């Protein structure tokens, strides 16, 4: 019947032509256009197009809009099944009602049941005030499902407009949050309340924009220039990730050779111990085809985290970066690395770690901020892990930092070292000062003792003699060795002791 086509075409207009045009004028796409761009052509099946709200307070009974402000369903991305929901800002500001939340709950349940990923797209303003406590209940149920899915299916969130109030806690419990520059923001309490309570005058962008959440607050995993770019990059990310915690990583045919050498790496490390180099260069010369997907690039830039491929299989990478803060570990970097390691372990992704670390960041600000526990987080993550772990020391590895960065002693499978490695309890001069404390008066004698200590102990060979390092390798062979190791390690079988859950510091 043509009448059903009419009903459908009327549901497809949301909250009016003029609100849609106002959305296009801000530079934003609509909910349905976003879905259309994310999914493969012709694959989208929609749920609950005709659902309506049932509130009768404050005159709500006179405006019943089909769909109640959210679009829900499932489709395919590059042939693989995905579930999704997309909020509609033109329908009561995207606010969440009882029926709204019921739709979201339906798709969450289905995604967990069929063990497939779920993508949320956010543009909205929280609980619908007119529906009072009812609205809140809805939020709660959604929250519950998030927690149930944590570590079973990947959950991705994409902030493409306002996200205020309770809404924010749903993305917070997902594995990745991405944001669009200049049109999105997140906060718990808004500017007016900030003014009435704290007398601070701030705009929405200044309080909760993409810069703040990608560079200062730890919340976001990345930003993008506009909606189209963001969605295309989400398509890119999904092709790296497993569908669930059972099936393993996806595999594609590679154009690269796993037996190629790279002479350039033999010159990467400078002769001067105080000149830096770019670890990213090494990461991009090791991965297949130079392709690397960085996570939290703008935050805690003394450490690098991301995804690449070796032999057509997804691998995760963690590395110290000498260009920033001399590569020291601090609380921000430790948190950034710890959550990445935990995700990869949950979904059976192998991890490679490149180590060049002189110690931790000193000062009252680190200690009063809780560096003890924050740095314990990364140690916990690595020591808990049962996926393959491969580590490479290019340069300095001093003190407890050496233990933390995927050492043999916390459970790493293979540990290599370049010829330029310096594995020691601390630098030479400090060690000598402590050992020869009663004789720190003379000068030439101090230089002699320091020379001797450096010649004996600032090298890879004491570690090799004890078996803490499996092999000292030439730089130009790094890829060749990595690719071989990972292959052999694909059969690793290991388990932690039986428990409800660990008690990791928070």
């Amino acid at each position: 019947l043509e009448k059903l086509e009419e009903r459908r075409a009327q549901a497809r207009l949301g909250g009016g032509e003029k609100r849609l045009e106002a959305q296009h004028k801000r530079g934003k796409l609509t909910a349905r256009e976003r879905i259309e761009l994310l999914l493969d052509h012709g694959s989208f099946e929609e749920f609950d197009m005709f659902v309506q709200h049932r509130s009768t307070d404050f005159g709500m009974e006179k405006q019943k809009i089909p769909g109640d402000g959210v679009v829900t369903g499932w489709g395919t991305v590059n042939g693989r099944t995905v579930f999704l929901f997309s909020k509609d800002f033109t329908v009561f500001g995207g606010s969440s009602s009882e029926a709204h939340a019921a739709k979201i709950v339906k798709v969450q349940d289905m995604a967990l049941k069929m063990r497939a990923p779920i993508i949320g797209i956010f543009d909205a303003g929280g609980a619908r005030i007119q529906e009072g406590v009812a609205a809140l209940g809805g939020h709660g149920e959604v929250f519950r499902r998030n927690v149930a899915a944590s570590g079973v299916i990947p959950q991705i969130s994409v902030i493409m407009g306002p996200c205020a109030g309770g809404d924010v806690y749903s993305p917070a419990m997902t594995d990745f949050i991405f944001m669009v520059r200049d049109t999105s923001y997140m906060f718990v309490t808004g500017p007016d309340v900030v003014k009435t309570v704290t007398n601070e005058v701030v705009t929405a962008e200044e309080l909760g924009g993409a810069k703040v959440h990608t560079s200062k607050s730890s919340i976001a995993d990345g930003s993008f220039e506009n909606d189209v770019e963001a969605i295309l990059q989400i398509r890119r990310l999904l092709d790296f990730l497993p569908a669930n915690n059972i099936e393993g990583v996806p595999e594609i045919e590679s154009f690269d050779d796993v037996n190629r050498l790279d002479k350039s790496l033999d010159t990467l490390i400078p002769d001067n111990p105080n000149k830096p180099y770019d670890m990213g260069e090494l990461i991009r010369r090791v991965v297949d085809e130079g392709d690397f997907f960085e996570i939290q690039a703008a935050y805690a830039r003394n450490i690098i985290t991301g995804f690449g491929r070796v032999e057509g299989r997804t691998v995760g990478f963690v590395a110290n970066q000498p260009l920033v803060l001399a590569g020291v570990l601090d609380s921000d970097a430790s948190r950034k690395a710890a959550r990445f390691v935990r995700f990869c372990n949950a979904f059976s992704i192998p991890i490679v770690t490149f180590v060049d670390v002189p110690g931790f960041l000193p000062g009252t600000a680190q200690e009063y901020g809780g560096l003890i526990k924050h740095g314990a987080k990364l140690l916990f993550a690595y020591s808990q892990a049962t996926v393959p772990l491969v580590t490479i020391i290019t340069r300095k590895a001093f003190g407890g930092a050496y233990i933390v960065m995927a050492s043999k002693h916390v459970g790493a499978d293979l540990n290599y070292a370049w010829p330029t490695a310096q594995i020691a309890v601390m630098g030479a001069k400090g060690a000598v000062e402590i050992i020869f404390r009663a004789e720190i008066g003379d000068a030439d004698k101090v230089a002699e003792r320091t020379k001797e200590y450096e010649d004996r102990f600032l090298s890879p060979f004491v570690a090799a003699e004890r078996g803490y390092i499996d092999e000292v390798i030439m730089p130009h062979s790094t890829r060749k060795r990595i690719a071989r190791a990972l292959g052999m390690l694909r059969t690793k079988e290991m388990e932690q002791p039986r428990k409800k859950h660990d008690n990791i510091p928070l």
Binding site: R80, N226, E229, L232
Partner: protein, 209 residues
């Protein structure tokens, strides 16, 4: 920017690259049903630094055939592999080498003294991309603040000198590691506040354009 037969060539190459990658991408494991049951759209839109080309792509056995709106065709042949920095091959009875670099959702291409950013869409994706606005950068101004506390070990510029974006200006040392500060904008050096030997706190003034 490119114009005339040059641009065309570049556009064709872009299409080819896209095609190749897409083919590989459709062999991913874990799909719901078989990919042979899918379809590839022939009509494509190549955007080349603010210049659109409507094209049609067809696989000629092993090579590619790219047709334009003018009815003019171009066969494309090469053995390029993703990762190599030079695309060498033939585009319609002519041998060419293009410098390829990766770009977010696209490539950056150089050929015959011309350079262009290249993106390849379908019709619908292109018309949705045309809804996105062009944004302008704010632009740094008037200052070079020290982002890390440390010692000033060298200054490579002098007052009354002109610099171009990305040029080094000073070196700051902290925790036994140097740090090169580079110019973020183009301009001329007006004043120098700090010079070799002095310790600086975070967000301290080194110079002003």
């Amino acid at each position: 920017e490119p114009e005339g037969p040059v641009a065309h060539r570049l556009a064709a190459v872009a299409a080819a690259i896209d095609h190749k990658l897409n083919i590989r991408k459709r062999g991913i494991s874990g799909q719901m049903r078989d990919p042979s049951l899918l379809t590839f759209q022939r009509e494509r839109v190549v955007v080349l630094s603010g210049q659109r080309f409507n094209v049609t792509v067809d696989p000629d056995g092993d090579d590619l055939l790219v047709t334009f709106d003018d009815g003019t065709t171009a066969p494309v042949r090469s053995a390029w592999r993703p990762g190599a920095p030079v695309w060498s091959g033939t585009v319609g009875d002519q041998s060419v080498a293009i410098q390829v670099r990766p770009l977010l959702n696209g490539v950056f291409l150089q050929h015959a003294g011309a350079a262009a950013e290249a993106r390849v869409f379908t019709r619908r994706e292109a018309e949705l991309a045309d809804l996105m606005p062009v944004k302008e950068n704010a632009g740094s101004g008037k200052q070079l603040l020290c982002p890390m506390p440390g010692l000033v070990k060298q200054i490579m510029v002098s007052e009354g000198q002109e610099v171009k974006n990305g040029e080094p200006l000073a070196i700051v040392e902290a925790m036994k590691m140097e740090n090169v500060l580079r110019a973020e904008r183009d301009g001329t050096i007006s004043k120098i506040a700090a010079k070799e030997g002095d310790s600086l706190a975070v967000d301290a003034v080194i110079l002003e354009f």
